């Protein structure tokens, strides 16, 4: 039994998730594709409305071909992440600078949390509806070990959307001014998540699940730093980042993120 | 043991083939790709193919066709494929001396009736029987699901294991068909076809064992007869489909029939340059 606010807090996040998560990627169009890292090698599949199936197999040892597509696809995911935060009441009340700082530090993490919901552990494929991404002693790349472990927990929709709230309202993000207001918000999401697990998962397989989930968020925070550095090493060599990704990567706060600033003011 | 004219007759067709047959399809670019109604779905089910497209880096794009507007996806591509092939078929005839000396209308009539047949003969050279795939260099076409006469023709012709000289002689016999619609020089073309047929019959005797290839010439002639029937069949199927869904290129519309040189001005223009 949750409090009348904890129940109201989850319904707001679940409604926020339903309104902003395009699980089928139906509105994901006008993206780049390979024209006619070694652990994260993926094979792109693209199904059509008529039932046709395009399949792209990347070449072997010679790798920057799929990055333009993965940049466009991740940008579309982050646009839904922005809209997810805009409809949360606790997020819109924050200053416009903290909304940019929180979305800068939680862009990658909230994308991963949504990808794990469409990840297939048995087939190794990220079933993104229209598109699919199938992989080619391999769960050492922290990106994939995180997804396989998180998928093993078999979390609910309420638990996934609560991890997004805890990751979004991180008080120790670079540039956050209201560090105490964000920390007060983050504590309530963790309390609601801890209370939800106790009321709906009495099984022994889900023992210490809240501490496991919090440990995943800490690991995902470390993987966020690793991948951001790995992608800046490639951007320095081969420019592949989208205009919105350059603002996140850091390539006066609202003046350096004019796209993020405009998206936070439009009607959600 | 061929005559010096039969020897020079083959040397001209081989030079004709090597100048106009892009066996690697290196110059086939800028083609379309996948982005009375009941009478169409028949042949489409028999000729369902999966397109493969390799890249310079080694990447492989593959298009699997949608299972049973459903099969109209490969039509724009195969129209560009057929058009590119036929333009090389036109260039093949434009360098043959016996073809240039014919009237400009008889040249159009021969190319109209032998367009499909000469295109199949070149497609059989790049067909892989054990894998069932037309290996067109960067492009590949593998079918799924020998009942279709066009498929039975390719499997039977590939089993004969003909030479490059025997393939180019089949193109000469099929090109110089005197009974094509609109041909005026029935006496000249029929005598030309006999000269190529005699050379093919004499080539098999002089360059192959006698008893094992005793009826190889008659088998080849039987293939051209069966291929002549498939040319009629396939032309009717695509006229039923083109009338419903336009997929034919302007050069294909002239062949399909959609004053002789004025109704085939594109084919005429390609014969003048
Ligand atoms: C399991 C993770 C999902 C994805 C498959 C569904 O896995 C990949 C697999 C293969 C590849 C390559 C090797 C083919 C390129 C890449 C990725 N994944 C990214 O490329 C990615 N993941 N997150 N972000 C991201 C987004 C962002 O907002 C726009 C800001 C910063 C971001 O990175 C700090 C990005 C760009
Ligand atoms: C058998 C080898 C060809 C090709 C390659 C594997 O197999 C096909 C496979 C599938 C398909 C569909 C049904 C899925 C589209 C078609 C075809 N092949 C044709 O559609 C074709 N073959 N020849 N011609 C042709 C050309 C011409 O010159 C311009 C004039 C008249 C012609 O037909 C009267 C055409 C149009």
UniProtKB/Swiss-Prot annotation, chain B:
Key words, A-Z: Activator, DNA-binding, Metal-binding, Nucleus, Receptor, Transcription, Transcription regulation, Zinc, Zinc-finger
Its biological purpose is as follows:
Nuclear receptor that binds and is activated by variety of endogenous and xenobiotic compounds. Transcription factor that activates the transcription of multiple genes involved in the metabolism and secretion of potentially harmful xenobiotics, drugs and endogenous compounds. Activated by the antibiotic rifampicin and various plant metabolites, such as hyperforin, guggulipid, colupulone, and isoflavones. Response to specific ligands is species-specific. Activated by naturally occurring steroids, such as pregnenolone and progesterone.
Name the gene behind this protein. NR1I2
Expression by tissue: Expressed in liver, colon and small intestine.
A Gene Ontology annotation in the biological process aspect, one of them, is:
positive regulation of DNA-templated transcription
Q: Does the keyword Transmembrane apply?
A: no
Q: Name one GO cellular component term.
A: chromatin
Could you tell me which residue ranges the NR LBD domain spans? 5-258
**Intact protein stretch covered?**
142 to 431 of 434
Q: Which residues form the signal peptide?
A: none
What residues bind hyperforin, as annotated?
82, 120-123, 234
Keyword DNA-binding listed? The answer is: yes
What family is reported?
Belongs to the nuclear hormone receptor family. NR1 subfamily.
> Which compartments is it annotated to reside in?
Nucleus
GO MF term set:
DNA-binding transcription activator activity, RNA polymerase II-specific; DNA-binding transcription factor activity, RNA polymerase II-specific; nuclear receptor activity; nuclear receptor binding; RNA polymerase II cis-regulatory region sequence-specific DNA binding; RNA polymerase II transcription regulatory region sequence-specific DNA binding; sequence-specific double-stranded DNA binding; zinc ion binding
Q: Oligomeric state and partners?
A: Heterodimer with RXR. Interacts with NCOA1. Interacts (via domain NR LBD) with CRY1 and CRY2 in a ligand-dependent manner.
For this entry, the protein name equals: Nuclear receptor subfamily 1 group I member 2
């Amino acid at each position: 039994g949750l409090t009348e606010e904890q129940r109201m807090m989850i319904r707001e996040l679940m409604d926020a998730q339903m309104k902003t998560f395009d699980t089928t990627f139906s509105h994901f169009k006008n993206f780049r594709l390979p024209g006619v890292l070694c652990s994260l090698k993926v094979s792109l599949q693209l199904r059509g409305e008529d039932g046709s199936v395009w399949n792209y197999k990347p070449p072997a040892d010679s790798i920057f071909s799929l990055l333009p597509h993965m940049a466009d696809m991740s940008t579309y995911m982050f646009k839904g992440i922005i809209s997810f935060a805009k409809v949360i009441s606790y997020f819109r009340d924050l200053p416009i600078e903290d909304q940019i700082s929180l979305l800068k530090g939680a862009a990658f993490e909230l994308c991963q949390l949504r990808f794990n919901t469409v990840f297939n552990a048995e087939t190794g494929t990220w079933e993104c509806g229209r598109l699919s991404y199938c992989l080619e002693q391999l769960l050492l790349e922290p990106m994939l070990k995180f997804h396989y472990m998180l998928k093993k927990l078999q979390l609910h929709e309420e638990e996934y959307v609560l991890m997004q709230a805890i990751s979004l309202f991180s008080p120790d993000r670079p540039g956050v001014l209201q560090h105490r207001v964000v920390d007060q918000l983050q504590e309530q999401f963790a309390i609601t998540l801890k209370s939800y697990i106790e009321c709906n998962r009495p099984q022994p397989a889900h023992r210490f699940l809240f501490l496991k989930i919090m440990a995943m968020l800490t690991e995902l925070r470390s993987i966020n730093a690793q991948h951001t550095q790995r992608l800046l090493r490639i951007q320095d060599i081969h420019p592949f980042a989208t205009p919105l990704m350059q603002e996140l990567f850091g390539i006066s706060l609202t003046e350096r993120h004019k796209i993020l600033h405009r998206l936070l003011q439009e009607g959600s």
